[PDB]
Specification:
Length: about 190
Amino acid sequence: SQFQSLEQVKRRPAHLMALLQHVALQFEPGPLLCCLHADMLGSLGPKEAKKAFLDFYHSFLEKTAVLRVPVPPNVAFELDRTRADLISEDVQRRFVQEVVQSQQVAVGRQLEDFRSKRLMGMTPWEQELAQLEAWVGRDRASYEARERHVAERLLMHLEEMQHTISTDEEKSAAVVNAIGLYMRHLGVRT
């Protein structure tokens, strides 16, 4: 049930990597990557979250952003009229939540597609995910360690096959960096 929702998969590194590889090769990766980085932003302090939000802006909200996601007109309007310093923590959370809300449909459809394809054996790394099923155990920390180990191998593999993400080197690089950033947040060594 790791794929029932983004909330459930965002915490499972190996399962998330499989989903990421699927999306990166079958859809526009922007929406899902945006949601993951937005969640990551929510676990940072006021100071760190401020710098992280600017990166989030440059990666997913700015006009020339390679991974630009469809931005709510209200947010885009306000961003173009708000100075970085003027950005309050409250206003920042609003922008993030509104942006994340507008990605739910696309990400929801992508999760749906992943679940259907998975039943047909049309999703990557199913063998690894299957093998993890036998090791949940009684110790959550030891299981979590196993998940991070598998995810690391999947991340290494995705980087090697970077060119298959897109013919645009700027795009594939942006995707790898984006996934790398979030995986590091889950304790997955790059």
